[PDB]
Design a binder for this molecule. Structure first.
Ligand code: HEM
Ligand SMILES: [Cl-]
Length: 154
C-alpha cells in the first residue's frame, strides 16, 4: 500500500516494539498527557479539572486516567491496524473529527502530541528504545498526526 509510511520490515519492527510498550499503556498514556501539560500549559485549560493539580496528583486522579487512556488507545489501535490501511485511516480521521466540538481547538494542536508520545516511548521502553526504533517512530507518529489533521479539516 502506497499510503502507509513504513516498509514491511519497519512495520513488523513497529508492531514488535509497540506490543512490549503496550504492557504499560495506562502509565505511558499518563506521562504523554503530562508532557503535553508541561510543554504546552495552555492545553491544561481544555481539561478544566487538571488545572489546579501537581503532576503526581494527576497520575493518581481518576479523571486523568480516563483522559490519558483515551489519548493513547487510538495510537494502540493504529499499530493494530497497520495492515488494514483503510481501517487505520478511518479511525485516525474519526479521532481528528472528535476535536471539532471542542471550543477553540486548532489544527496545529495535534503536532504537539508527537513530541510527547516519543517522550512516553523513551521512558517506558528505556533500553528498548533503540536507534532503529527512534527513526521508525519519528516517521510513523508524524504520519498519524497528518491523518488526524485530515479528519479535522474535512
Ligand atoms: C493527536 C493526538 C490525539 C489523540 C489520538 C486524541 C484522542 C482523542 C479522542 C479519541 C477523543 C474522544 C474521547 C472520547 O469521547 O472517547 C479526544 C477528545 C478530546 N481531546 Fe484529544 N487527542 C489528541 C490530541 C489532543 C490535543 C492536542 C488536545 C488539546 C489539549 C486534546 C484535547 C481533547 C479534548 C479537550 C477532548 C474532549 C474532552 C472530552 O469531552 O472527553 N486532544 N481526544
Ligand atoms: Cl482495510
Amino acid at each position: 500500500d502506497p499510503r502507509f509510511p513504513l516498509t514491511a520490515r519497519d512495520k513488523f519492527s513497529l508492531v514488535k516494539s509497540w506490543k512490549t510498550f503496550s504492557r504499560n499503556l495506562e502509565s505511558a498514556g499518563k506521562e504523554m498527557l503530562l508532557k503535553l501539560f508541561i510543554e504546552h500549559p495552555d492545553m491544561k485549560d481544555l481539561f478544566p479539572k487538571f488545572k489546579a493539580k501537581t503532576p503526581d496528583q494527576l497520575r493518581n486522579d481518576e479523571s486523568f486516567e480516563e483522559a490519558a487512556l483515551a489519548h493513547i488507545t487510538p495510537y494502540d489501535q493504529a499499530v493494530q491496524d497497520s495492515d488494514n490501511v483503510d481501517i487505520l485511516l478511518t479511525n485516525l480521521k474519526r479521532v481528528g473529527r472528535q476535536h471539532k466540538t471542542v471550543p477553540g481547538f486548532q489544527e496545529s494542536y495535534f503536532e504537539r502530541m508527537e513530541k510527547c508520545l516519543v517522550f512516553a516511548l523513551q521512558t517506558t521502553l528505556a533500553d528498548a528504545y533503540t536507534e532503529n526504533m527512534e527513526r521508525i517512530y519519528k516517521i510513523w507518529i508524524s504520519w498519524t498526526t497528518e491523518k488526524i489533521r485530515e479528519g479535522f479539516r474535512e
